[PDB]
Structure formats: C-alpha cells, structure tokens
C-alpha cells in the first residue's frame, strides 16, 4: 500500500478558488467537485482538524452554487458554450457531462436536461463512422491546453474525449439510441487507433475504451502498445510515467520535454486503474506523487482533474482488494464439510480432503477480496481403457 493523500492546504486552495474574470470562471469551479468525490468516496472528511460533519455540508453549499454556475454555459438547445452569443462547442458539451456525471453520485441532477444535452452531441455531431466533430467558431481555450492536435489526430482526441463524457453520465439517461452511439464510436477508436500517432492520443483513446469493454481483442492490443512506451527510473521500476513524443520531432529545446506528459501518463494511470492491475500502477502513483516535486505543479486544471480522479480511484481500489473472505465448502446433500474464514492475517487457511461423493459447493456471502479455490481430484484407471491405452499387450 502506498500513500496518496492531499495537503491540508491544497484542498483549501481548490475549494476557495480565485475570482473576477468570467474567463476560466468554470475552470474556477470544476475542482471542488473532484475534491468532493475524492473526499467523500475515499472517506477522508477526517483530515480537517475542525468539525468534519459541518465541513461536509460547507462544501455541499459551494457544490450546488458551483453546479448552477456551470449551467451558465448551457445554450438554448442544451449544448454548452462559453458565450451564448459565443458559440456552441462540441468540446465543452462533452466536458460538462463528464463533470456532471461524477457529481451525480451525491448531488442529484436534472435528468431530462442531461438527456437533451446528450442527444445534442449524438444526433448532430457524429459522422457515419462514429467519430465526433468540433462544431465551429473553433476557439483555442486556456483551459483546454494540450488538446489541440494535428491532422486526424484531433478527431481521435475529440471522439475519445466526448466518449468519456458520455460514458461518465450514461447512467442518468440510458437511451437505446445513445448506447448505439457508443457502440459506433468505440469501434472507431479501436479500429482507428492502432498505428499510434501520439502518446497523448494513445492514452486518452486507451482510457476511453478502458471505460467500455475491457476484455476486447483490439483493446488489449492497444493497451499493450501504451504499456510498451512507458519510462522507468530504477530497474525493477521504482518510478513510471509517459512522455509525449514520436521519433520525428526532435529539437534542442526545453518545450518538447513538456508537461503534456503529466496529462498523458494520467490517462495511462486511469486506464490501468480500471484494469485493476495494481502491480503496474504502483510506481506511477508513487511517481505522480513524486511528480509534484519533479513537476512543480500541474500546469492546467485539465490534467489536475484527472490526476485527482486517479488518486481517488486508487485509494478505493485498495479498499476493494483487501482480503476479508468467509468461504464455505459443503456437500449439496450430505452434511456440512468444513469451512474457513480467511483474511490478511490468515490467508491460505488450509487444504482438506473430500470424504464423500456428493456434489461440492464452495461459496462466500458478500465479502471483500480475491480468493483461489483448487480442486485437485485423484483417481485410478485400469490399463486397457481408451483413455490411457491404445495397444493389446501380453508377456
């Protein structure tokens, strides 16, 4: 187990915010939602030193204020914008549903809203091949950061980024029509990622399919690719991360070795954290942890939302994984054969024999962990059975 917490202050800043410009106003308020998801879901109300119970409600007040605050950027037709006069942006629309979906857990949303907002993207902004398009009035945004990309490479980023929103908030409006939309889109990402264009593209793409069918042939192919680009310090690895680069793209400059990587490796971390391959994940969060020092800070809120959801998911993957089992072996008809309570302290409780010829039933109620049952059976057969022999012998 590794420690991944937050400074008492850090949170303080995030919750307090800075104020003035409408610009990055939204950017102003997104973090609170994450600092709540992480603070509630991984229970950590306790950090404060004051009264945790009312402090929880203090954030809630800020959280609902902030909830309508985002609505400001919602249009007529339910599509998110920066300015109503402004323009409707396919980018922000996805990014809203992504923020909302995580929040819906503990702050109930306007259901009918979420839906029409969804149906906007799907019915209007999806090609015949699943891929999504940014609407127009194209605007570089300070918040967006590393998102800008070249050639089709941007179709991929966006399709995957909008997939993420739709995955995140699908629960709230499970529509037969938008599940289909997900099917078509997912296929794009699988069937159109493989010859990898960027590390940043590989990663979100990986992460987006990571929120879908995580057993898929093509997908695990992709995940392998990403998993092979990784950087390490110390072997066996103590530290692991990803840098954004391709073999064509070298200059004697500081900028290429540029933060973009924190975002890309954050998408990797989030990908694997879904696969629940903690072995892979450990050197990353140690390093991402270690990152603040090496990194200085996370340049823009975009990655900082993903880093936080990382630390969140991990601290609650640990929790799922701990062994508190209560296994029971019994004969279906004849009596109760023994049964053993298995924990961290007393794992691999025993081996026991099977006495009687009654179907065997191994079975825990609700419990937390991972246990392995082996049923090695021992039998004797004559020589001249087809099973073993193929010839007629004598001597």
């Amino acid at each position: 187990i590794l420690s991944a917490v937050l400074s008492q202050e850090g949170i303080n800043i995030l919750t307090h915010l800075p104020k003035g410009s409408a610009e990055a106003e939204l950017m102003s308020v997104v973090p609170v939602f994450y600092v709540f998801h992480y603070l509630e879901t991984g229970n950590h109300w306790n950090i404060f030193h004051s009264d945790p119970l009312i402090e929880k409600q203090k954030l809630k007040k800020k959280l609902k204020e902030g909830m309508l605050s985002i609505m400001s950027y919602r249009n007529a037709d339910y599509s998110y914008s920066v300015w109503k006069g402004g323009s409707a942006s396919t980018w922000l629309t996805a990014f809203a549903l992504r923020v909302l979906g995580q929040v819906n857990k503990y702050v109930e949303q306007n259901q009918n809203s979420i839906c029409n907002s969804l149906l906007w993207l799907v019915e209007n902004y999806q090609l015949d091949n699943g891929s999504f398009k940014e609407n127009s009035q194209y605007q570089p945004i300070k918040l967006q950061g590393t998102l800008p990309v070249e050639a089709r490479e941007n179709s991929l980023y966006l399709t995957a980024f909008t997939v993420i929103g739709i995955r995140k908030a699908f629960d709230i409006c499970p529509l037969v029509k938008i599940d289909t939309a997900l099917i078509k889109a997912d296929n794009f990402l699988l069937e159109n990622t493989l010859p990898a264009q960027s590390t940043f593209t590989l990663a979100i793409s990986a992460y987006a399919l990571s929120l879908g069918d995580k057993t898929h042939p093509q997908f695990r192919s992709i995940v392998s690719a990403l998993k092979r680009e990784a950087l390490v310090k110390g072997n066996p690895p103590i530290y692991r991360f990803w840098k954004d680069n391709l073999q064509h793209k070298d200059s004697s400059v500081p900028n290429t070795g540029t933060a973009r990587m924190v975002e890309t490796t954050a998408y990797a971390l989030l990908t694997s954290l879904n696969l629940k391959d903690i072995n892979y994940v450990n050197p990353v969060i140690k390093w991402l942890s270690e990152e603040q020092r090496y990194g200085g800070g996370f340049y823009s809120t975009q990655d900082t939302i993903n880093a936080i959801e990382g630390l969140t998911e991990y601290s609650l993957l640990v929790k799922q994984l701990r062994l508190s089992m209560d296994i029971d072996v019994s004969y279906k008809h004849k009596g109760a054969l023994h049964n053993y309570k298995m924990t961290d302290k007393n794992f691999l409780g025993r081996p026991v024999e099977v006495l009687l010829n009654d179907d065997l039933i191994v079975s825990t109620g609700f419990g937390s962990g991972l246990a392995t049952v082996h049923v090695t059976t021992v039998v004797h057969k004559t020589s001249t059975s087809e099973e073993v022999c193929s010839f007629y012998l004598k001597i």
Binding site: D213, L231, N235, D277, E290
Partner: protein, 594 residues
C-alpha cells in the same frame, strides 16, 4: 544593463571594469565640481581557454557548501551561496592585464582650454605615448602643450586633472600602483611600465570572458534535481535585492546607483553637489526622464496557470519633455500550486529515464518469466518476475470463455505447470469494418447462428458475399479488406462509351475490354455472317464499325425464331427512320424500349 528571462552573457558588453572604490571614487569625486571624464585603456592578452562542456570537476569547498543545503526551499540559506561563491562561471575567456585609467577634469577648465572632444581625447592619447609608454614617439602638437590649460601645468594636459582613477587589472601590484598618479610616482620611471608588462604574464587577471549560470554546475550531488531547481527559484528572489529600483530618485535626472546598502546619486553633465542639486549656470535644463518603481509582489496563482506583477512609471515620473520610461508595466508568467504531498519534501537526483522494453536483464531471482497465454486468451495478472509458487490466472478475450483449468503455477524449476485450459466460445464480434459498407443489424456481439447483411449506397453493390453467418467461432468468412462496393464503369456516357477526360469518348476494343460480360450474338455487314462475341468488345466496336456491326440476340448464338428474327431485324435496317438503342444496339422504328 540586461539583467532580464534566462541570464547567460558576454563581457564585451558591460565595459564597466569598476571596483568597489573604482566606481565609488568617481561618483564621490563627481560631487566636488561639475566634472567630465576621460578614459584610456590598453588590453594585454595572454591566453584563451575553453571550459569543457560536460563532466566538470567541482571544488571541495564548493561541493561542501553546496551540500549543507536544506531540501525544502529556504531563500535565507540559499541566497548565502551566491554571496560566497557567485552566480556564473567561465565557459571561455582571456587572461592578462589592462592599462585602464579614468581622468577627472573640471568642466570649467576644459571650457577654458577650448579643445574639441577629439582634441582632448588625442592629447591624452599622445601624451600617454610620450610619458608612460616609453616609445620614441609621434611628434607632439603644441596645440596640446601651449593651450591655456596645459600652459598652467608645464605643458601637460594630463597633470591638469583634479585626479585620475586606476582601473588597472593585472601584474605585480608594486608596478601597477606606480602607474596611478602619486607625487611619489610623480617623478616615476617609464622603466616602471615595461617591467609591469612582463609581470602581467606571470600574474594575470581574467578579462574579456563569457559566463554561464553557477546553477548549471550543480548536477551530480545527493539531491541534484531537488537542489538545482530549489536554486533557480532562489536565484530570482536574490536578483531583486540587487536592483536599484528601490533607490529614491535623485534631484536632477540623476540616475541613482546602488552599492551595498546605499544609493549614491550619479549626476547629469553640468550638475554637481552631494545629490546633484548644485549646478553652475552652464546647466540650462529642467527636463526629467521617467524611471520605474520597483516591481509588484506577485498576485496569488490563478484560475489559469497565470500570475500578475506590475510597476508604474513613477519613481521619477517624466516631466516637461523627459524620456518616457521603457519596458513592461505588467508581467504574466504562468504558475502553480502544491497539492499531493505531506511527508517528504523529496529527493530526486539526476537519474536516467528509459523506455521500459529495452531493459530485460536479471534472472538470479529464480521466479518464472511471464508465460504464454493460450490462443484467444490473456494473463489476468502482469509482472516481469513471479515468485516460485505464485499462480497466474488465464482468462479469455471477448466472445470466448474459459474451458477448464484456468491457472499456471510457477515452479522452482523456473518452469510453468500448464493447465487443462482452452478458449472455446462462439460469439462473433462486429467484423473487420471497411468505412464504405454498413452491417445490419448493428450489435456489439452476435450469437452463433445470426446473420449480418452488408449493404451499400444505391449506385453500388458488395464485392464479396452479402450475408455472413456466425458458426464455429468464425463467420463464413469476412474479407478483412478484400471487400467494398464499386459500381461498373467507375455526365454519364452511353453504353458504347466510357468517360476519360470529362468528355464522353469511346472505349477502345483492344484495351478496356477484359471484364467478362455475357456472350452476345452479333451480325456483321462486312462478313455477311455473324459471330458470338463478348459484350464489352461489341459496344466498343459500335463506335468504329456500328453501321457494319449490329446487335442481335442475347446469349451465345443459337438457332430459332430468335436468330432468323435478329437477321431480319438488321436486314430491315435501311428503311427504319428511328432506331432507339437502350441496352440493345437499337429498337425498331416500331418498338419501344421497355
């Protein structure tokens, strides 16, 4: 003055070889009376040097103090090293000596001498030559010997000065000190100067040199990355104290300069006195130039990376036509906040990154390597090394499910015990999709026995078959790139012709015909018989010899009414005023294409 941004630089640019009292004596002398100054210098180069770029060898005293540095930033203790060791180090430079002297004349005296700037500078140039340089010399000019000023000092221009300041770097101090004006050196020897010159090669000083930040030096200590970045930050804050922006302005467009803890005022020409308040009636001006206030304190880090700093043009805000101060009122740099950690204040050290694939190296450990999943499956549980007796669980890819013993066990052997395991399962997934087609129905997974229907737009149909079915884990079988929808004859042109140049001209019999159309039957007026012929080839030959070659009868040539009829058909051809030509060469005058 380019303190700036990143700060490496060249020493041809400062031209202030000014010591503690080198500059201070001049400023303090300048308060005594309206003064002008005459500089004379002579470089004496000895050698160059290039400090090698990497793997530099640092000193004990330095490496020492460079260590007793705390991990956590502390402007207090960090600043310390700049005071003691410095800021930059020489990548390259020269070593030797400089004859460098600054002469102080009361501007009243110069006006009394009446010499032009070019004259005055030259009288010092040639007088030095005669008096100190020892050379059998350029002929003097009585312009420099018998003017109203030199006349009052035994014909010397130099001895006219209130005093001189020595900026001589190099050689033995005995010989150097003598070259500065003193009554003791006042009957001194030219002999002195040549002796000094030899001394300079045995006792040089660094002149004419390039620099680079002392920080780039600290690269391989315990906590390099930590202390090196801790120091760039500390470098910024250290810079601010040294700036003279904080000095209050000087009475008369005087530019205040800092040394140590004090601002002494630098005076404009025609002003003197302790703070440039006094002026002889020669100064005939009250224009004031603007100079910045000091910078602001940074604004707290923002909604964006962004942060703010500010000055205003008010220290000596401009008046009655003084120069507007030049630079930035404002400054955006981007910034950050610290969020994750409590414990460490960590130490990273100049490690070396590596793509993971390239290091595959140790087996002493004796755990088993990653094993081989079976076809259509994967290992649930990735590592490089597994301890002996560990299990790894095999599961199957989508649409396939485990049949049997799901585990391999790591043997002390190094070998794997390998299970009774297979990935049988029948659930076809959505096939290798070509952008062109569209399958129906559209699902994530298909059941054993469901069929899909490949369909395309109107003008087109499918290259391979249209209906695949899901049997024994395969279909029956999809092209995987061998299938899309392209229409025959890829302003449409008539059946005899093809398009080639955005203008409808005939397809050539020999060339374009090749793809197997139906065996047609055709009558030929030149032959007076018929022949069975491919269709493509026929519709070409219409162009050339149509009036010779008619359309007759679909299928290979064969007897019946069909044949006797097509014969009549094109025997009655002459009188027919109207022949239609849809798929047939023609429709009779009497018929309609149907």
């Amino acid at each position: 003055n380019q303190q700036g941004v990143p700060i490496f630089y060249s020493s041809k640019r400062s031209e202030n070889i000014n010591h503690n009292s080198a500059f201070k004596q001049a400023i303090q002398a300048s308060h005594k009376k309206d003064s002008s100054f005459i500089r004379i210098h002579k470089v004496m180069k000895v050698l160059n040097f290039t400090t090698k770029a990497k793997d530099l060898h640092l000193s004990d005293v330095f490496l020492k103090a460079l260590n007793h540095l705390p991990l956590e930033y502390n402007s207090a203790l960090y600043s310390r090293i700049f005071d003691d060791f410095g800021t930059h180090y020489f990548t390259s430079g020269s070593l030797g000596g400089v004859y460098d002297l600054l002469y102080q004349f009361s501007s009243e005296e110069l006006k009394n001498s009446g010499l032009t700037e070019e004259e005055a500078k030259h009288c010092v140039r040639i007088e030095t030559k005669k008096r100190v340089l020892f050379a059998k010399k350029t002929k003097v000019e009585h312009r420099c010997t018998t003017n109203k000023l030199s006349e009052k000092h035994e014909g010397s221009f130099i001895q006219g000065a209130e005093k001189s300041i020595s900026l001589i770097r190099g050689g033995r101090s005995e010989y150097g000190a003598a070259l500065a004006w003193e009554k003791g050196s006042s009957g001194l020897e030219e002999k002195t100067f040549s002796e000094w010159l030899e001394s300079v090669k045995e006792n040089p000083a660094v002149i004419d040199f390039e620099l680079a930040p002392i920080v780039d030096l600290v690269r391989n200590i315990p906590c390099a990355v930590t202390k090196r970045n801790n120091l760039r930050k500390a470098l910024q804050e250290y810079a601010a104290k040294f700036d003279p922006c904080q000095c209050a302005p000087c009475p008369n467009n005087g530019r205040p300069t800092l040394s140590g803890t004090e601002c002494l005022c630098v005076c404009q020409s025609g002003t003197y006195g302790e703070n440039c308040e006094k002026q002889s009636p020669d100064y005939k001006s009250n224009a004031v130039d603007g100079q910045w206030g000091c910078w602001s304190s940074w604004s707290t880090c923002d909604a964006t990376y962004k942060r703010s700093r500010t000055r205003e043009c008010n220290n000596p805000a401009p008046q009655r036509g003084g120069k507007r101060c030049e630079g930035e009122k404002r400054q955006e740099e981007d910034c950050t906040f610290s969020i994750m950690e409590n414990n460490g204040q960590p130490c990273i050290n100049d490690d070396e990154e590596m793509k993971e694939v390239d290091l595959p190296e140790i087996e002493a450990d004796s755990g088993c390597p990653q094993p081989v999943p079976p076809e259509n499956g994967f290992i649930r549980n990735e590592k490089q090394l597994y301890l002996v007796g560990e299990d790894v669980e095999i599961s199957c890819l989508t649409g396939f499910e485990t049949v049997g013993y799901q585990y391999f066990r790591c043997l002390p052997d190094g070998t794997w015990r390998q299970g009774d395991v297979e990935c049988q399962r029948t659930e076809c997934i959505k096939p290798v999709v070509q952008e062109v087609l569209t399958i129906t129905p559209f699902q994530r997974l298909y059941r054993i026995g469901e069929s899909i229907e490949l369909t395309c737009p109107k003008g087109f149909v499918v290259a391979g078959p249209s209906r695949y079915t899901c049997q024994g884990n395969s279909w029956t079988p999809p092209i995987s790139n061998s299938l899309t929808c392209e229409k025959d004859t890829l302003g449409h042109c008539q059946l005899g012709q093809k398009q080639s140049g955005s203008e409808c001209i005939c397809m050539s019999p020999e060339e374009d015909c090749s793809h197997h159309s139906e065996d047609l039957c055709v009558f030929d007026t030149d032959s007076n018989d018929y022949f069975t012929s491919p269709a493509c080839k026929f519709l070409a030959e219409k162009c050339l010899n149509n009036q010779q070659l008619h359309f007759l009868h679909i299928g290979s040539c064969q007897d019946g009414r069909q044949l006797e009829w097509g014969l009549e058909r094109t025997r009655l051809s002459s009188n027919s005023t109207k022949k239609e030509s849809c798929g047939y060469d023609t429709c009779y005058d009497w018929e309609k294409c149907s």
